[PDB]
Curated annotation (Swiss-Prot), chain B:
Function: Component of the exocyst complex involved in the docking of exocytic vesicles with fusion sites on the plasma membrane.
Oligomeric form and interacting partners: The exocyst complex is composed of SEC3, SEC5, SEC6, SEC8, SEC10, SEC15, EXO70 and EXO84.
Compartments (UniProt record): Cytoplasm
Note: Present with 1080 molecules/cell in log phase SD medium.
Family affiliation: Belongs to the SEC6 family.
Protein name per the record: Exocyst complex component SEC6
Residues of the full protein shown: 303 to 353 of 805
Swiss-Prot record, chain C:
Identification of the protein by name: Exocyst complex component SEC5
Subunit composition and interactions: The exocyst complex is composed of SEC3, SEC5, SEC6, SEC8, SEC10, SEC15, EXO70 and EXO84.
Role description: Component of the exocyst complex involved in the docking of exocytic vesicles with fusion sites on the plasma membrane.
N-terminal signal peptide: none
Further information: Present with 3400 molecules/cell in log phase SD medium.
Family: Belongs to the SEC5 family.
Length: 151, 51, 32
């Protein structure tokens, strides 16, 4: 379980190439065709592709000098087409999802899929950054019971 | 809610296009804000413009 | 990869209160 190397090589490399592909496929637009088409498939595919690249977005802030130097450097060029081509792909699909949900119907399947991505990754993002703010509040509960013991 | 409150605030056309027709298209975007609101809570319970 | 097992259905299934786009499997957003 401390041997996640090849998954990080084929999934950081496949996170590079396939989210370069998901910089258009999961960042689908033009125009709606049910909002991407299907932004619960598309924009939330860029959300989980950005949750697999939350290894390069949120667990880049967890892997802060863990064991090596190129885990977030040689994979950072694998996160240029990996993280901001998935997170902003979910934000082109999310700003174009809610903008697609700002389109007068909008629609019975376009805002269904699009808003379903924008509640799934929205509330999942809320409990996620609430788990990181509760990592500074569970660390403020925990490490500030250790560093700020006071002893 | 700021796409119906930026479409709504954008539908002011501050003249007011006769003298006070800002809330005509703006409140029309408020009717589209109720329809998009309840349609989106029919779509998404957790977030994305419930009400 | 960038699906990412499964951003098509199961990661849109973190809420998925939208029946039926369907575009997302099942089911809810909170169980507390």
């Amino acid at each position: 379980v401390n041997t996640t190397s090849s998954i990080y090589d084929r999934i950081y490399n496949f996170v590079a190439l396939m989210e370069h592909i998901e910089r258009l496929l999961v960042a689908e637009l033009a125009e709606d065709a049910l909002e991407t088409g299907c932004p619960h498939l598309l924009e939330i595919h860029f959300l989980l592709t950005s949750a697999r690249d939350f290894q390069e977005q949120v667990v880049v802030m967890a892997k802060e000098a863990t064991e090596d130097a190129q885990r977030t450097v040689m994979k950072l060029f694998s996160r240029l087409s990996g993280i901001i081509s998935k997170f902003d792909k979910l934000l082109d699909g999310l700003t174009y999802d809610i903008v697609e949900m700002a389109r007068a119907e909008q629609i019975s399947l376009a805002i269904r899929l699009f808003k379903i991505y924008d509640l799934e990754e929205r509330e999942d993002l809320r409990i996620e950054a609430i788990r990181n703010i509760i990592k500074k509040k569970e660390i403020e509960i925990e490490k500030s019971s250790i560093k700020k013991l006071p002893n | 809610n700021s796409i119906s409150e930026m479409f709504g605030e954008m539908r002011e056309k501050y003249v007011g296009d006769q003298k006070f027709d800002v809330l005509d298209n703006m409140d029309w975007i408020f009717n589209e804000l109720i329809i998009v609101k309840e349609h989106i809570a029919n779509c998404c319970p957790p977030h994305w413009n419930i009400f | 990869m960038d699906r990412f097992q499964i951003g098509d259905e199961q990661l849109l299934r973190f809420y998925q209160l939208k029946t039926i786009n369907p575009t997302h499997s099942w089911a809810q957003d909170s169980s507390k």
